[PDB]
Design a protein around this ligand. Structure first.
Ligand SMILES: OC[C@@H](O)COc1cccc2ccccc12
Length: 288
């Protein structure tokens, strides 16, 4: 029942996984993954939703436009908007992780009419993310790798030696912990062969979180609204190196109507680390 194909939106062709029929469940991955990370969710909800897992511009088989400007939050947000539309929908249930959550969160605040329900995994909340980057010394040690992703020299660390950098970041842990199969691993290797690490990096080269005058602002990306009122669910890997727990502190002020599930065991990418647990929390949330 699973299809893979393209969609023209916003001046690009995005590759996307598709399965099932009905109301739209849209999954947004992040760095350095792709549509595949959502495999377990697609298998699970596709008899109740039309599950669509998208390859963010630059990633895997999606077009890879040139210039930092092609990877501005405004652009990416519009990408998402055009996708719900062009898939035949005026709204969806939006499931987000990492960079996809940065985009997703922003989209949701900006277009609450387009999101019936938001499910968010480890990744930046527009408001708290900024707060912890100011107050949380642990979050700054944690986010230090971002200062680093700005340098040209970085991409070679990642691609060099058959993607040594990326394999040890993502493949090694998951193979030894048991959540990556040998086919999952071929899947990833191909995605990095087929996508561009340059464009992957370009997402960060637009981040305005570096100058002291950059850190002053309230929201990670610009936002008129400071409250999101749709039903939201956080599913959170408590042991994630890149995001400190304080990120979820006082979050209800910015999302009244939120539910939060913390996996003390799981790390950055709960969705494929502990699929059955993540899946049951999702079910429960979807029916509340
Ligand atoms: O607390 C804030 C930090 O997480 C900042 O990190 C990020 C900012 C914007 C996009 C991001 C995407 C993926 C991971 C981290 C991101």
């Amino acid at each position: 029942s699973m299809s893979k194909q393209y969609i023209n939106v916003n001046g690009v062709n995005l590759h996307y996984i598709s399965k099932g029929q009905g109301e739209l469940m849209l999954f947004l991955h992040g760095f350095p993954d792709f549509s595949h990370i959502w495999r377990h969710q697609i298998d699970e909800f596709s008899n109740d939703f039309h599950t669509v897992a998208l390859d963010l511009r630059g990633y895997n088989l999606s077009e890879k436009p040139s210039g930092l400007e092609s990877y501005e939050i405004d652009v990416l947000v519009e990408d998402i908007r055009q996708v719900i539309e062009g898939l035949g929908y005026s709204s969806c249930t939006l499931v987000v992780h990492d960079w996809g959550a940065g985009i997703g969160w922003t989209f949701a605040y900006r277009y609450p009419e387009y999101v019936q329900k938001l499910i968010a995994f480890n990744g930046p909340h527009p408001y708290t993310a900024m707060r912890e980057l100011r107050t949380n010394k642990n979050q700054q040690k944690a986010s230090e790798y971002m200062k680093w992703f700005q340098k040209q020299e970085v991409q070679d660390y990642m691609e060099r030696d058959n993607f040594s950098g990326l394999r040890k970041l993502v493949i090694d842990p998951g193979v030894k912990k048991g959540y990556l199969t040998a086919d999952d691993v071929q899947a990833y290797m191909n995605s990095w062969e087929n996508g561009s690490v340059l464009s992957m990096l370009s997402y960060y080269r637009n981040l305005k979180i570096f100058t002291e005058e950059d850190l002053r602002r309230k929201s990670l990306f610009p936002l008129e609204e400071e409250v999101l009122n749709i039903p939201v669910q956080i599913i959170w890997g408590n042991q994630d190196p890149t995001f400190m727990p304080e990120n979820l502190d006082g979050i209800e002020e910015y999302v009244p109507n939120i539910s939060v599930h913390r996996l003390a065991e799981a790390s950055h990418a709960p969705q494929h680390e502990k699929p059955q647990e993540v899946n049951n929390v999702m079910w429960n949330f979807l029916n509340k």
